[PDB]
Amino acid sequence: PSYQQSPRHFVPTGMHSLALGTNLVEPLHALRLDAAGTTQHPVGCAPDEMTVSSIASRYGLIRRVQWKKDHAKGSLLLQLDADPFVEQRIENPISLYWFAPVGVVSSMFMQWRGSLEYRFDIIASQFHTGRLIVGYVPGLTASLQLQMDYMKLKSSSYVVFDLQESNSFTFEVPYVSYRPWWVRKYGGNYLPSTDAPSTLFMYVQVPLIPMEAVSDTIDINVYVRGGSSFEVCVPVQPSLGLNWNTDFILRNDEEYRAKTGYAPYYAGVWHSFLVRWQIAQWPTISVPRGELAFLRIKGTQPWRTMVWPSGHGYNIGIPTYNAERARAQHLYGGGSLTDEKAKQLFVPANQQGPGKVSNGNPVWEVMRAPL
Amino acid sequence: PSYQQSPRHFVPTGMHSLALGTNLVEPLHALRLDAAGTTQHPVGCAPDEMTVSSIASRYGLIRRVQWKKDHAKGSLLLQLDADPFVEQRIENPISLYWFAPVGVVSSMFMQWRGSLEYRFDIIASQFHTGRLIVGYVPGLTASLQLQMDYMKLKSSSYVVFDLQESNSFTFEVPYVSYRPWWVRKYGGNYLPSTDAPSTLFMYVQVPLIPMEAVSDTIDINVYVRGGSSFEVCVPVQPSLGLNWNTDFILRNDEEYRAKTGYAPYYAGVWHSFLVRWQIAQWPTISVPRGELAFLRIKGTQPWRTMVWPSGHGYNIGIPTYNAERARAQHLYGGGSLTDEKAKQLFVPANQQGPGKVSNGNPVWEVMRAPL
Amino acid sequence: PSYQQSPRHFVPTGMHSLALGTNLVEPLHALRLDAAGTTQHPVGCAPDEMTVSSIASRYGLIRRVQWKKDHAKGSLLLQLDADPFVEQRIENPISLYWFAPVGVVSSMFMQWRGSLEYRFDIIASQFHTGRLIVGYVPGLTASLQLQMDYMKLKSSSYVVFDLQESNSFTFEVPYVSYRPWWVRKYGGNYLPSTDAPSTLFMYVQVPLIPMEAVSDTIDINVYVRGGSSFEVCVPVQPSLGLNWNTDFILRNDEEYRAKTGYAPYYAGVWHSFLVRWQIAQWPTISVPRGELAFLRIKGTQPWRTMVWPSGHGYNIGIPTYNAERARAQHLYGGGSLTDEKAKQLFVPANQQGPGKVSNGNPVWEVMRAPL
Amino acid sequence: PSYQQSPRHFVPTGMHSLALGTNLVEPLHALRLDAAGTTQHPVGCAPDEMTVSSIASRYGLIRRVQWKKDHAKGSLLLQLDADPFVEQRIENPISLYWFAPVGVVSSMFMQWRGSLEYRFDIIASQFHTGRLIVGYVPGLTASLQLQMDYMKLKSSSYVVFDLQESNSFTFEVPYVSYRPWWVRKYGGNYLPSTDAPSTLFMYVQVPLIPMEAVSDTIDINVYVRGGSSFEVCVPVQPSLGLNWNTDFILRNDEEYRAKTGYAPYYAGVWHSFLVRWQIAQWPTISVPRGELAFLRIKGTQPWRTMVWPSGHGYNIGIPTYNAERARAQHLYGGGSLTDEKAKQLFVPANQQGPGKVSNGNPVWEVMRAPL
Amino acid sequence: ATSDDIASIVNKPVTIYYSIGDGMQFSQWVGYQPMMILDQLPAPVV
Amino acid sequence: DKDIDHCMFTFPCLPQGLALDISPHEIFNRCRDGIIPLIASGYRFYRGDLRYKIVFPSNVNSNIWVQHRPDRRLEGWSAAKIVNCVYNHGYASHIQITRVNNVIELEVPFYNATCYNYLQAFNASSAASSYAVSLGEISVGFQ
Helix, strand or coil, rough: CCCCCCCCCCCCCCCCCCCCCCCCCCCCCCCCCCCCCCCCCCCCCCCCCHHHHHHHCCCCEEEEECCCCCCCCCCEEECEEECCCEEEEEECCCCCCCCCCCCCCCCEEEEEECCEEEEEEEECCCCEEEEEEEEEEECCCCCCCCCCCHHHHHHEEEEEEECCCEEEEEEEECCCCCCCCCCCCCCCCCCCCCCCEEEEEEEEEEEECCCCCCCCCCCEEEEEEECCCCCECCCCCCCCCCCCCCCCCCCCCCCCCCCCCCCCCCCCCCCCCCCCCCCCCCCCCCCCCEHHHHECCCCCCCEEEEECCCCCCEEECCCCCHHHHHHCCCCCCCCCCCHHHHHHHHHHHHHHHHCCCCCCCEEEEEEEEEE | CCCCCCCCCCCCCCCCCCCCCCCCCCCCCCCCCCCCCCCCCCCCCCCCCCCHHHHHHHCCCEEEEEECCCCCCCCCCCCCCCCCCCCCCCCCCCCCCCCCCHHHHHHHEEEEECEEEEEEEECCCCCCEEEEEEEEEECCCCCCCCCCCCCHHHHHEEEEEEEECCCEEEEEEEECCCCCCCEEECCCCCCCCCCCCCEEEEEEEEECCCCCCCCCCEEEEEEEEECCCEEEEECCCCCCCCCCCCCCCCCCCCCCCCCCCCCCCCCCCCCCCCCCCCCCCCCCCCCCCCCCEEEEECCCCCEEEECECCCCCCCCCCCCCCCCHHHHCCCCCCCCCCCCCHHHHHHHHHHHHCCCCCCCCEEEEEEEEEE | CCCCCCCCCCCCCCCCCCCCCCCCCECCCCCCCHHHHHHHCCCCCCCCCCHHHHHHCCCEEEEEECCCCCCCCEEEEEECCCCCCEECCCCCCCCCCCHHHHHHHCCCCEECCCEEEEEEEECCCCEEEEEEEEEEECCCCCCCCCCCHHHHHHEEEEEEEECCCCCCCCEEEEECCCCCEECCCCCCCCCCCCCCCCEEEEEEEEEEEECCCCCCCEEEEEEEEEECCCCCCCCCCCCCCCCCCCCCCCCCCCCCCCCCCHHHHHHHCCCCCCCCCCCCCCCCCCCCEEEEEEECCCCCCEEEEECCCCCCCCECCCCCHHHHHHHHCCCCCCCCCCCCHHHHHHCCCCHHCCCCCCCCCCCCCEEEEEC | CEECCCCCCCCCCCCCCCCCCCCCCECCCCCCCCCCCCCCCCCEEEEECHHHHHHHCCCCCEEEEEECCCCCCCCCECCCCCCCCCCCCCCCCCCCCCCCHHHHHHHCEEEEEECCCEEEEECCCCEEEEEEEEEEECCCCCCCCCCCCCHHCEEEECEEEEEECCCCCEEEEEECCCCCCEECCCCCCCCCCCCCCCCEEEEEEEECCCCCCCCCCCCEEEEEEEEECCECCCCCCCCEECCCCCCCCCCCCCCCCCCCCCCCCCCCCCCCCCCCCCCCCCCCCEEEEEEEEEECCCCCCCCCCCCCCCCCCEEECCCCCHHHHHHCCCCCCCCCCHHHHHHHHCHHHHCCCCCCCCCCCCCCCEEEEEE | CCCCCCCCCCCCCCCCCCCCCCCCCCCCCCCCEEEEHHHHHHCCCC | CCCCCCCEEEEECCCCEEEECCCCHHHHHCCCCCHHHHCCCCCCCECCCCCCCCEEECCCCCCCCECCCCCCCCCCCCCCCCEECCCCCCCCEECCCCCCCEECCCCCCCCCCCCCCEEECCCCCCCHHHHHHEEEEEEEEEE
């Protein structure tokens, strides 16, 4: 039968979606042998655990607060921010930090909301008697980070605790803000994009009166767990990276490199022109009027000396036997590459050799000389 | 869910069909704002009329036949062909013609069949008495277009009419042919592709005997309408064009032009070579052995003088100051474009000027001179 | 199983439709995380408002009409057009205008129809007594914009109002026209494409007779609202633009620029040829026979001096040290770029420098000099 | 509505299948006007006939066997093969053959099987008395094509017939073979790919004893029809061609031609180089060490003289005025095309002329001369 | 194609295929003409 | 040296057939008028849609934008042909990409404030009647 009915009229696209991770049938090319095949979990291999609230219901130890005998009846113990992003610094030129699990799983999202149950575990005997406020002020800026004490704290929401026969309490930090959510404190590597919505405080309301058989000082551990109403919404670039590879590379510009896609190079010939990666580009050396430039690094021989515009839109670096032939007096002095003076200073083609390439993009040294 | 089931295996094509005009869903890109939108016709805007038989049931006036007193009892009045293509000539170098509506709507098809009701409206008083045969012979060729008279007509099918108190009759021309259809008489502009299937005739059986108070001459009007069984089938190139634009352009070859896709040109430079459209081509002048050729038409100056093979596969036309520098003695005499004699005769680059282009493809004049 | 059945036979197209905005399923690549996800509106975030008739049922204040004591019993107060496009001029080289909301939402469409309720709010005390016609003549052209007075007005439809204890009335301007719709008065920036269908008039039938304790003059405010039968159909280019950016750029031709896609440029080298954007084009200076041209604007140095055809189909601008080397006597005098005279006047390659580009398309100055 | 569901994931192919000719919906671009349109057959136009067994049930006359009086009681009449491919030779450098319809419709297939009813129509009066075996031996090779007579025939299957008052009998040749099918005897033009499965024989068991009033000789006609169990399966290249065009072209190599896609040529210019088709290639003349070659065939003038490698990877043929300039002494003698001796021997560009092309690929003559 | 680009396409093959497509219905039988056997065609002697 | 905004050619859109532009074009020199103006000669008015399917050459690669402009009138039967000359916002638009397929297709609707429109060749007698001949104006421009 002839199928003369007029056919469909579509739009091609090259790739399936990426951010979609839900009720959406995704077609692929499986390297499995079976079309109905799915990876499976036998009777012991059914895994225990994955959920944001499964992470946010785990305490993470975040602050060691020393609490001595002679701390006065208004002394501050912590002014730490009432976000999940709690600063705990470990003592490299970059620094590493502990976080609560609710802190990191907040740092893989844009926005968060809900309570934050911080657990104060006050490690003492039943012979120590203490008393301390855990207060909570909504909305204190950096300039209002000072002027704080317990007397101005008790205006806001606060919980006074007596350290006695029970030694532990989990305060539930409220979520009090104008906004339904709250933007991540740190964001990507981006200097704009906001501090905490609110601040926790912990002042010693009545100081420790210990017995003379026990110690003057007492550890207070501060855990952080996301509250029962905690929830995060928008998946963005995470603000935290692992410490499997703490290596970092700066990108200052005073040091030299070959241009992108032109290293590694090798000494060779070129019929338009020794000089390749197709000739490898080189950066234009910022030479003002009345100077010259030549290069010495940080074939048949290692080429430790080498810049002039080729004429095809990009610079070239010509190898020389030494820095003497390289030492640019002719070319910056008004010459050209087709000069007999220049062609004598060049290296002939026979020095191409086996032509072993450079190791990556070797940083040359920019020597600038007066003309 | 991973969709691992193996997908479809089609054929692309670039365009939907063109001749299909029927029960066939056609997908497009509508510039209407609505997907379900269709152009509509309100209560007065529902149009009255579209159908081949709606056209073929309209009389069109096609022949004025004078019918005098002294026409004899066998005189011919019309031998016109029994197709819908009835020749009515209007008195330009092309001529224009009236047609019946069934004639034109036959001329938009390949084939036709069915009856052809020609209406004879014989405009006379009731005092005129006449009598005339409307005969119909199937299958008379051009050589049999002669030898015709009423006595040999009455062998075939014929209708004798008396012009009296009623003055009008619509004869129904039969469709008598060997073939189920009949090819269009004229076709495209194509000298092969056939005359009429059959011929109508109209002889005066008894001549007009008028009264002496009325006129000797009588108009007979001949209308043509497609019959009730008329039908056409195959849609082909129409054989008739409108008279909105009766302009016609011949294509004789003795006059000159630039080649297709190379006019308009302009005087300019070219690094391989003044001489552009990318250099504009020119026709190869049919010069036998022992002549020369130069051009004069029918930058900084108008270039009224200008042909030699460039060497890149196509001819070029070089501008000159005058017909003297143009007057071809060097090049047809064995020279070449790289000659110093030739390079002196050329126009230098400074005469490019603002470079206003030629108006279309200006017809040059081919001057042929002896060598 | 082998699927040997013959497959589909389609047509590709590159893009989904644009004007379609209706019952039409549109496939995209959502950056949302969920396939069934849709932006939502919680209990306070369900928005109040969107509809053409929601805009056309809002009064906009459009005319302040002074109405004094000594205005006579036929004096005109407004002859303003009975379209929604009501002219209200604010006192820049372009001018800005208020409009009714029905005026703008008419100006985002091609055609409109229906009534136009103009509200006359006549601000007076109950001690003022007035009387004024609001007339309406269908179809007065510009030459018939004169000859108007109340006595010739009352032939048409008119409403006489008494200014008394009630001070406000909303007259409903009829829609009286030959056409079912009416084309937009202004259109795109296009000097053809029609004035109003009809004209409103407002004459003082009986003049204001105020009491001697109140004022001689009275404000009359004229609001415009689209009527209940108002409706617009065809979505076209809007005739009105915002005043967020009232900047406008003329396009006169006497000033100079680089060609499109060739600015910004930079001084550099080129192996076929200093001279780039790949050499940047320049406009052909309209030089008649017997002149010369050089450029001075409105690397190692700023290049304030710079046109000749390159030979590759487009002009080039060569940099010079000064206007002296630039001052064109050689090239317009019959020379060429390969001349030794020309090559001495050129700037050598060493002056390429770091090669900072020009700021955009800097307007040069065309100096034309005699030869 | 936004259609965010992830779309299909196919494979394009350029063309629908070709060997598929069955229950398979084939989409096309019909030049018919109607989508549901199908070519039709009215009441007389319903055609009578198409089927392999409709062809295989038709007798075709295939052998005239003379049967004289004095043929002995063992004389052979035919040893013809028991395939449908029956050899009947007509008395051109190729020869033409009759075949049975079952022979040809077997020759449009690879394999055949089933019975073969050969009809012996023995044209005689009732006064002639005869007797003859129609035997059938399965599996006799070419070396066993000899040693055959009726006494060794009657071991196999055989039918003895008496020529009497009835004169005609249709013997049904069995299908006896090891294989379910049997490969075509002839195949494509391919010298490997098998003789008959089995052989028919017809010996005169008792010789003709005619009466002395009738003739000594008797015609025997041998028809071939495919049997009732005949069937063919695999559609391959047919082994038989029509005699509408019995022209054949050999492809010996000693004669000359231009290379494929380079004829017709024309004399013209070329900027890298007179010499075109883009220069037309020529075959490399097999010249050993110490000879020369020039060409004379079997612009402004006809170019009857013309091979050297161009340098761009393919040979060129340069036109000369005569065979003297052509007579290769310089180039085979160690010269080159850039020699002044060579450039004098070349034809200058002015002899390009109107440039009428050659007729097809004109066979040149390869003249080989000693150096 | 314009005159410049069609010059590259000179001496390129354009192949046309064919088949009947289910509408074809052959009429009255006629016997076959004389046939040529294809292996009898000569080989290209080199 | 046209800007990217510049229309490459504009033409009014009508089923009447163009002002016939006959180096002549050998079709319009030879095959006069085709079918649809030969039928459209037989009716004084019309009302309805049109389809276009504009075909572009091979050596072009750039993206193509196509506009419908129902604002544009038709001034006389002269200049009712294809005109070799900006892009606009609110007009109905479509871009065909050359690299996918160099043939755009269109369903240009009926946008007139009329009961129907003139179908014979139009002499522009009435000044507002120029609003009532073309469906609008299609413009093809390149990027």
